[PDB]
Each structure stands twice: as structure tokens, then as C-alpha cells.
Write a protein that binds this ligand. Structure first.
Ligand code: YKX
Ligand SMILES: OC[C@H]1O[C@H](O[C@H]2[C@H](O)[C@@H](O)[C@@H](O)O[C@@H]2CO)[C@H](O)[C@@H](O)[C@@H]1O
Length: 518
């Protein structure tokens, strides 16, 4: 749990130009004597927050911007402070993708959007609609080909179809996200995912198709179409398939709406090499020659660097990428994106395999996606009304009946725990000696140790929240009322992170209300 001084370790995904990046690393070493190690570990976006939390991991992490808000909220990223001269060399909308709570948390590299990639030797004209793909597959099957193969294991690739007829992650209106408004189990999302499951039912696609199987089938000329990003174009070039990159097909007359990613470079908060990392990213990578080295290995898409994007913009494959991006939406970077992606990943795999119906799969994804927000509403309200003696008059909002009935249940069963276990609560309160916001930050570790490692049931969840209320009452009494919302956020994090799968299996807080129905 200590990063080594006087070198740079970089993590980037195995689908990106990591050999090109290593070439930029060699140029840095030639000037500075500092070795640059580029690694592409499996699941690096899940590994980074685990290793970084212990003061370990790479100096620089590359991922799409959507994961970076979670990393920033967890204190895992150094604030990026480039001068005006450097900032003005990149597109302002790319800087917006890496801004979190008013602070830049990464360097933007390139804009990524999925396109429809088609074999001009099999399909001279690509289909304008999803609805015509079954008929095309039937024509191509008669010739020993298939219409379409793409990765069905990552919701990134299926999302554009789910979003087409009105599926959404977090509602965006008046230039602001309603994190309370999730659109995963609406009629639009159901129509999109039913269309995908029907393609599998009718044997136009196979539920087991992943990135490697789709790429091999397209690059060998066995399938007429794939869905992929700019990074894929290198392997297609090598294959000598006569390919086009175009607009994704429409669904029910509406565009497919890909979630747009900005490949971004974050600096580990635990790195002792932050000045070397800034130098590397600003004066080696984010140059015409640095981006060219990476782009020549695996294409980046529409680069953040204006000078180089002017050259690449002339490429009709980049025009197609930006057309799809404009029909799509820039991903949020809110910490909840991780849970959203896990919930929709499971829904698509289960619907595609027949493990769940579309209705069952998207219900669970909806419950999973709103679990943090709903849990925080209940827990924050209970802690604050316990501390002050007065309830919150603010409307409950989305799924408000559940929130109201959960808080009602918690008042009954939680007050019971605090009354019956007053001596134990007082003993643990004094032993923990909670005085201020720094001490509250130390509770997460002991909550995971005591709560998360014990049996999972609603009773032990009531104790977790009820002791939280007991601590909140103390914090109010000693003029530390400012600590209660952070405490509520910390309890919610432990509960929903460590009991995610169990909570969704219970129908979340509806399960809680039913379990303690007297
Ligand atoms: C029929 O049975 C029941 N019906 N219902 C409604 C409940 C039970 C029931 O039996 N529940 S029980 O099994 N629950 C536990 O054991 C338990 C569960 C979660 C806990 C947790 C304990 N904690 C240790 C406790 C605190 C007081 O002394 C501890 C314990 O004695 C050593 C005790 F009193 C247990 C009695 C429980 C009622 C038994 C607190 C904890 C660690 C410390 C830091 C910290 C900070 C915050 Cl903000 C928030 C929480 C925490 C983690 O959360
Ligand atoms: O499938 C969910 C997944 O989608 C995005 O990941 C993309 C990434 O943006 C691309 O650069 C490329 O590597 O493919 C990935 C999909 O396999 C999100 O960025 C990611 O957080 C999310 O889990």
C-alpha cells in the first residue's frame, strides 16, 4: 500500500492503444530518465477503487469519464489544475465531462461513441431501422451469413437500443439531473429490450455473444454488421473487410442513443509522482505527436486536442462517430453510475438468457439503480428527526409511498432496538468517542467489520440504522449537527454496497415494510 517514487505506472483498458501509449512513455523516459510502465489489467475499473483506497495502484488511470465521479467522491483522484494556455487547447465540453463538484478530476483524451459497422461486400447499403434486421438476417442466412453480431455481455452496447424509445438512466431537464428519476423499467426501455430478446428468441442473435466472438465473426466476414467504437477499427483494417461506419439503426422511428464516453486520464491521490504525471499527460500525451502514437495503435475517436481533432475530423468514420454522439447523451459521472451499469448489465444478461422475463429483469435493474438514493432518503430522515425531535416536511418524491412506509416501519422497530439496547448503545457510543466529522469518517471501516461480515437480515439492518440514529442524537447534543448528513451518507454507502444483491432480491424497502408488517 505505497506507490514507488521516480517512475510512472499507467493503467488503460486492453481494447485501447496501450502499445502506442508505451511509445509515448519511451519518449518521456528519453527526456527525463523516468521509466513508464503501461499495464492493461482485467476489470481495471473495479480494481482501481479497491487498490487506490489502500494508497496503492497506478499513478495514472485511463477510463471513460463516467467512473471518475465515484473515484473523486472516494478521495482517490488528485485535483487537475492546468493553466489557461493548456485548458484552451482542448474542447470545453471535454473538460465538462471530467468536472465533479466544481473541480477538474482528470485530463480528457478523446470522445467515444458506438457506430454501426457494416461489410459493404455483404450489405452495400446498411439498414436504417432495427425492425428490418430480422428480414435481412433471413436473406443472409440463406447465403450462410448473419445480419448482426455485437457484445451482449456489456450493457454499453445494448443501451442505445434500450434508450431509443424512452429508456434513461437519470432524467436530465433544465440543465440538471434528477437522480431521483430513473427510466430503466419504463415502456421505452421494455420495448428496446423486448426487441433484443426477440432477436435472440428468433435466432438472429445468440445470448452468449461477447466482444471477442462478435469481433472475430465480423473480421472473418461471417456477419454483415457489428456495433463497436473507434478502438475496433485497427483490427478491421488488418482483416481487409470492406467496411463502412454509419448511424446506428432507428427503433420505432427514433434514433439509437449511445451513452457517449470521454476517455480520461486521472492521477491517483496516493501518487508521489503527481508532477511527473502532469508533465507526462500535458507535454507528452496531449500533443499532436502523443495522440498520433496512441491513435495509430488503436483509434481514439474524436480527440479532445483541437489541433489534432482538426486533422481527424476529415475522416468519415469520425464524422459517423460524432453523428452517433450527437444523437446520444454524454454519460453522467455521478458516483451512482457504477450501480446503474451493474443493474442494467445483470438485466440484459438475464433477459437475453431467459433467466428472467424483460419485465422481471428491468424491475430489478430499476430497484438496483434507485437503491442508494431511496436508502439515503429513509436513513437521513430517520437520523435527523431522531436528533432534532421534528420530522422533515419536504415531499418524499419518487417511490414516496415506499419511503414513507419504510420510515414509518423504521420508527416502530428502530425506536424498539434503541430502547431495549440503550445500555449497549451508550457503551459502544462512549467506546467509539465520536466528537467531529474526522471521527465519523472512521466509522465506515468498523460498520463494514461489524455489520457487513455478520448475518444479512432486516433485523441487523435496523440495528445498523438505529445505532446511527443513537450517534446522530449525540452529535446534535454536542453542537455537531453538521456531522449527521455525512453519517447518513456513510451508513447508506455501507448498507447498499455490501448488501446490494440481497436488498434487490428483497424488492428493496418494499421487502422491509412487508417483513415488519404487524
Ligand atoms: C430479533 O433481533 C433483532 N431485531 N431487530 C430489529 C434487531 C435485532 C438484532 O438482534 N440485531 S443484532 O443482531 N445486531 C447487531 O449485532 C448489529 C448490527 C449492526 C450493527 C451493530 C450491531 N453494531 C454494534 C452494536 C452497537 C451497540 O453495541 C453493539 C453490539 O454489541 C457488541 C450490540 F449491542 C448488539 C445488539 C443488537 C441489537 C443485536 C453497530 C455498528 C458497529 C459499530 C459502529 C457503528 C456505527 C454506526 Cl453509525 C452504525 C452502526 C455501527 C454496526 O451496526
Ligand atoms: O458496459 C458498461 C460499461 O460501459 C462503458 O464502458 C465502455 C467504455 O466506455 C469504452 O471505452 C469501451 O472500453 O467499452 C466499454 C464497454 O465494455 C462505461 O465507461 C463503463 O463504466 C461501464 O461499466
Amino acid at each position: 500500500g505505497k506507490i514507488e517514487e521516480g517512475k510512472l505506472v499507467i493503467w488503460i483498458n486492453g481494447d485501447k492503444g496501450y502499445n502506442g501509449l508505451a511509445e509515448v512513455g519511451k519518449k518521456f523516459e528519453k527526456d527525463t530518465g523516468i521509466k513508464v510502465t503501461v499495464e492493461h489489467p482485467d476489470k481495471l475499473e473495479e480494481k482501481f477503487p479497491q487498490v487506490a483506497a489502500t494508497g496503492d495502484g497506478p499513478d495514472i488511470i485511463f477510463w471513460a469519464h463516467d467512473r471518475f465521479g465515484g473515484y473523486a467522491q472516494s478521495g482517490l483522484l488528485a485535483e487537475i489544475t492546468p493553466d489557461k494556455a493548456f485548458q484552451d487547447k482542448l474542447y470545453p465540453f471535454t473538460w465538462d465531462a471530467v468536472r465533479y463538484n466544481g473541480k477538474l478530476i482528470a485530463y480528457p483524451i478523446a470522445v467515444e461513441a458506438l457506430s454501426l459497422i457494416y461489410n459493404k461486400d455483404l450489405l452495400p447499403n446498411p439498414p436504417k431501422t432495427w425492425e428490418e434486421i430480422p428480414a435481412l438476417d433471413k436473406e443472409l442466412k440463406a447465403k450462410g451469413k448473419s445480419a448482426l453480431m455485437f457484445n451482449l455481455q456489456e450493457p454499453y452496447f445494448t443501451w442505445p437500443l434500450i434508450a431509443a424509445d424512452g429508456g434513461y438512466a437519470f432524467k436530465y431537464e433544465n440543465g440538471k439531473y434528477d437522480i431521483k428519476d430513473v427510466g430503466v423499467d419504463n415502456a421505452g426501455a421494455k420495448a428496446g429490450l423486448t426487441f433484443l430478446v426477440d432477436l435472440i428468441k428468433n435466432k438472429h442473435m445468440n445470448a452468449d455473444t461477447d466482444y471477442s466472438i462478435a469481433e472475430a465473426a465480423f473480421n472473418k466476414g461471417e456477419t454483415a454488421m457489428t456495433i463497436n467504437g473507434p478502438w475496433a477499427w485497427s483490427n478491421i483494417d488488418t482483416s481487409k473487410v470492406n467496411y463502412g461506419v454509419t448511424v446506428l439503426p432507428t427503433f420505432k422511428g427514433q434514433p439509437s442513443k449511445p451513452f457517449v464516453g470521454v476517455l480520461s486520464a486521472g492521477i491517483n491521490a496516493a501518487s508521489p509522482n503527481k508532477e511527473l504525471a502532469k508533465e507526462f499527460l500535458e507535454n507528452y500525451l496531449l500533443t499532436d505527436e502523443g495522440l498520433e502514437a496512441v491513435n495509430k495503435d488503436k483509434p481514439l475517436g474524436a480527440v479532445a486536442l483541437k489541433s489534432y481533432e482538426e486533422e481527424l475530423a476529415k475522416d468519415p468514420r469520425i464524422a459517423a462517430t460524432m453523428e452517433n454522439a450527437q444523437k446520444g447523451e454524454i454519460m453522467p459521472n455521478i458516483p451512482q453510475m457504477s450501480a446503474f451499469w451493474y443493474a442494467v448489465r445483470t438485466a440484459v444478461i438475464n433477459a437475453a438468457s431467459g433467466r428472467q422475463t424483460v419485465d422481471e429483469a428491468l424491475k430489478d435493474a430499476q430497484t438496483g439503480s434507485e437503491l442508494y438514493r431511496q436508502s439515503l432518503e429513509i436513513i437521513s430522515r430517520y437520523l435527523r428527526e431522531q436528533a432534532t425531535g421534528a420530522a422533515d416536511t419536504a415531499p418524499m418524491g419518487a417511490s414516496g409511498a415506499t419511503s414513507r412506509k419504510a420510515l414509518e416501519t423504521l420508527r416502530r422497530v428502530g425506536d424498539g432496538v434503541q430502547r431495549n439496547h440503550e445500555t449497549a448503545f451508550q457503551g459502544m457510543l462512549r467506546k467509539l468517542d465520536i466528537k467531529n466529522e474526522d471521527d465519523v469518517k472512521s466509522l465506515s471501516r468498523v460498520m463494514i467489520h461489524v455489520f457487513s461480515d455478520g448475518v444479512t437480515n432486516w433485523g441487523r439492518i435496523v440495528t445498523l440504522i438505529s445505532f446511527g440514529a443513537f450517534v446522530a442524537k449525540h452529535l446534535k447534543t454536542i453542537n455537531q449537527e453538521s456531522c449527521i448528513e455525512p453519517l447518513a451518507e456513510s451508513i447508506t454507502d455501507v448498507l447498499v454496497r455490501t448488501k446490494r444483491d440481497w436488498l434487490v432480491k428483497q424488492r428493496g424497502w418494499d421487502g422491509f415494510v412487508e417483513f415488519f408488517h404487524v
